């Protein structure tokens, strides 16, 4: 796994997303609840994360937690470094949501090769 430190248009970003896992998301912030990004590393490494027990359509924060620590541990397995500002995400405010999206894009752009119904 190739990992990535330290760039999208907010409108350009969300719609990336959108398009990538066919979902109709409104706001950078949304991506608070961490299921997008459990996908993206399903997309980036087949069987590294466990869609089964990711909450697609999780509303607490504790559940948005659950799902980041469910990217960490694929991430701890995959060797990726990048430590994720779980409590600032959840809190699902724009600037760290927004932070965090463009790194994460970076990350998957490094590592993406590739091979709805998944959710």
């Given at each position: 796994a190739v990992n990535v430190y330290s760039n999208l248009s907010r409108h350009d970003m969300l719609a990336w997303i959108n398009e990538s896992l066919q979902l109709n998301l409104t706001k950078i912030e949304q991506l608070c609840s961490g299921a997008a990004y459990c996908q993206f590393m399903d997309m980036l490494?087949?069987?590294?994360?466990?869609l089964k027990k990711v909450?697609?359509?999780?509303?607490?924060e504790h559940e948005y937690i659950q799902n980041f620590k469910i990217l960490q541990a694929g991430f701890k397995r995959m060797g990726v470094d990048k430590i994720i500002p779980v409590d600032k995400l959840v809190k699902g405010k724009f600037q760290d949501n927004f932070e965090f999206v463009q790194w994460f894009k970076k990350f998957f752009d490094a590592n993406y090769d590739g091979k709805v119904a998944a959710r």
């Amino acid at each position: 796994a190739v990992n990535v430190y330290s760039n999208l248009s907010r409108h350009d970003m969300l719609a990336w997303i959108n398009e990538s896992l066919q979902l109709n998301l409104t706001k950078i912030e949304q991506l608070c609840s961490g299921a997008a990004y459990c996908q993206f590393m399903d997309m980036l490494f087949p069987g590294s994360i466990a869609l089964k027990k990711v909450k697609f359509q999780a509303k607490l924060e504790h559940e948005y937690i659950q799902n980041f620590k469910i990217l960490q541990a694929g991430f701890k397995r995959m060797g990726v470094d990048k430590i994720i500002p779980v409590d600032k995400l959840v809190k699902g405010k724009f600037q760290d949501n927004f932070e965090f999206v463009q790194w994460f894009k970076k990350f998957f752009d490094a590592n993406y090769d590739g091979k709805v119904a998944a959710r």
